[PDB]
Ligand binder design. Structure first.
Ligand SMILES: Nc1nc(N)n(-c2ccccc2)n1
Length: 339
């Protein structure tokens, strides 16, 4: 019979033994296990998406992207375990390097030195440069999706919400539904954007930088609507130039209806922060997405001078160019290489 963990089947075959329940992830149960071929403990996450088209989409995205990408700052897939036939395929197990912790857990309890903040931010952006060079948007960057090992090597994970960039089709109406994590949501998402441009990710990285500086999320919106409140509460009212860039009347007039708010200076919010870090923060957390700094510019910012080296910041060789039953088949096919 298959191995059991906390009631349910965690059937990872003979190669992976000594299972330990690590916790719950976005996809379900996650366990550590000893890899008998490589003699290391690994992370294994159990995925059960086949009953629902939406779950299948996210699982396929996660798998297809992570299998294509190969980068020091992006979590790899080492192995995928599943049944030999589609009919028997019940669950999929994704095997990854075991990572001590993640930035969410770390920030709950640990103060980061400026050196750590700098190093973490460099790695995030180095990983993001690769992702963006593949014409892909991560779209759910947040501390819990940044894994760390015992020597603080950082790896971006969870590409379930990722999309191919589509800037020509980015415009939408005001207060249009969105799925990515609220606190890390760029202001344009609530105004006139579907989140199909690279600038969406940079905003999230800015929030992450802010959160590393203080151990508190900078824009902790209590609900969808509240999020924009928090952002404007710190950036202050948008300029006329920036309003003029928003053609949609509902969005623009909403902003015009608000009482004036002044910018809160970054150095008053973060009195202990490196001034160069605050300069970079300001550029990532720019209201107008067209004026927001891009990943390659961020890497070249003086804050990151100790690490910046474009020849050692690789890009993707092959960028991405663009029902559940077919999705299960696609997932089955995408995972075939591990049989
Ligand atoms: N690669 C890896 N390593 C761990 N611990 N991971 C994990 C992922 C989700 C929840 C708990 C742990 N993932």
């Amino acid at each position: 019979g298959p191995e059991m963990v906390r009631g349910q089947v965690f059937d990872v075959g003979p190669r992976y033994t000594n299972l330990s329940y690590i916790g719950e992830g976005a996809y379900g149960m996650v366990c550590s296990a000893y890899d008998n071929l490589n003699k290391v403990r690994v992370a294994i996450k159990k995925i059960s998406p086949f009953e629902h088209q939406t779950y299948c989409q996210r699982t396929l995205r996660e798998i297809k992207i992570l299998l294509r990408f190969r980068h020091e700052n992006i979590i790899g897939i080492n192995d995928i375990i599943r049944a030999p036939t589609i009919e028997q395929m019940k669950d999929v197990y994704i095997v990854q390097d075991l990572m001590e912790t993640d930035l969410y857990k770390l920030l709950k309890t640990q103060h980061l030195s400026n050196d750590h903040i700098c190093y973490f931010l460099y790695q995030i952006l180095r990983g993001l440069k690769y992702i963006h060079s593949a014409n892909v948007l991560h779209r759910d960057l947040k501390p819990s999706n940044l894994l760390l090992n015992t020597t603080c090597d950082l790896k971006i994970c969870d590409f379930g919400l990722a999309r191919v960039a589509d800037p020509d089709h980015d415009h939408t109406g005001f207060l249009t539904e969105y799925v990515a994590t609220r606190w890390y949501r760029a202001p344009e998402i609530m105004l006139n954007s579907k989140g199909y441009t690279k600038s969406i990710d940079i905003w999230s990285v800015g929030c992450i930088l802010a959160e590393m500086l203080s151990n508190r999320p900078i824009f902790p919106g209590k609900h969808y609507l509240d999020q924009l409140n928090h952002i404007l509460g710190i950036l202050g009212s948008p300029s006329q130039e920036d309003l003029n860039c928003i053609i949609n009347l509902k969005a623009r007039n909403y902003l015009l209806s608000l009482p004036h708010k002044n910018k809160v200076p970054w150095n008053r919010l973060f009195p202990n922060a490196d001034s160069k870090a605050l300069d970079l923060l300001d550029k990532m957390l720019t209201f107008n997405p067209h004026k927001r700094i891009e990943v390659e510019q961020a890497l070249a910012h003086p804050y990151l001078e100790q690490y910046y080296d474009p020849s050692d910041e690789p890009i993707a060789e092959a960028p991405f160019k663009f029902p559940k039953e077919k999705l299960k088949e696609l997932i089955f096919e995408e995972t075939a290489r591990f049989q």
